[PDB]
Target: UDP-3-O-[3-hydroxymyristoyl] N-acetylglucosamine deacetylase
Amino acid sequence: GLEKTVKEKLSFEGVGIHTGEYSKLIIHPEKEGTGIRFFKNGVYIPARHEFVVHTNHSTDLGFKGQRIKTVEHILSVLHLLEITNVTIEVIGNEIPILDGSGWEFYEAIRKNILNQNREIDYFVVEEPIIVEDEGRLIKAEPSDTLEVTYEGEFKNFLGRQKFTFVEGNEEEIVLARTFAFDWEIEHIKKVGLGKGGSLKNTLVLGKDKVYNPEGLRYENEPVRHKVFDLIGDLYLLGSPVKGKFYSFRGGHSLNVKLVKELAKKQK
Ligand SMILES: C[C@@H](O)[C@H](NC(=O)N1CCC(c2ccc(C#Cc3ccccc3)cc2)CC1)C(=O)NO
Ligand SMILES: [Zn+2]
Ligand SMILES: [Zn+2]
Model:
């Protein structure tokens, strides 16, 4: 399809899940060929793998001493809507988590799309590839359509679950929230993370319990969210992606490892 920007400036604000600080976003329209980039304290940070500085519990970007935490959800929404040219101005240190899903970003951006004059030059997976990390695995193969499967093997009541996104089913993953296991929270807080995490923005699960009074939005909400996360990390290739992906227990580190191998392959 055509390259796309936003019709007008779009604003979002709220707490960041990791920093726990309040931050504000301003999504600015941009001309054809600009690409997706962040802007903080006079510095432009392109939404590309070369700018990744952290991958543990979030994908973070940095350039010239300016850092932005948790870019995955906003990038996933922009990837799904095929917004190719925008500047995301960040007043703070992290993208707001909002309700833990991409819903608010998705709804506001989809109503404000401006089609542009050039076609999208997609990042097209040309051959099969596999990346691994001690049991964890991500594979990609050619496909005319973006298809993303995530399979989890949870150590609680959820057990094994699988979910596949295909083009046209964007609404099936944009409402799936970030999640956490109660036995892992102490470690996350000890490593200086999850400061803004709560039952208002995270689906919190125990061995046999759901902490959230509203419960799960879907029986497989965690794997739908993991698919949404991978689509965000795939946008670090610098263009909307065409390929069929399968992730078995993948995370941001393995997602970025795949992205860098795909980019190197196509140099
Ligand atoms: C999903 C994954 O891929 C990942 N998030 C992840 O690993 N997180 C975010 C949530 C953090 C968190 C959330 C909630 C709480 C809390 C709480 C609480 C518990 C009981 C009662 C009241 C509040 C603590 C840390 C933990 C790490 C993700 O979405 N990456 O894009
Ligand atoms: Zn996420
Ligand atoms: Zn950790």
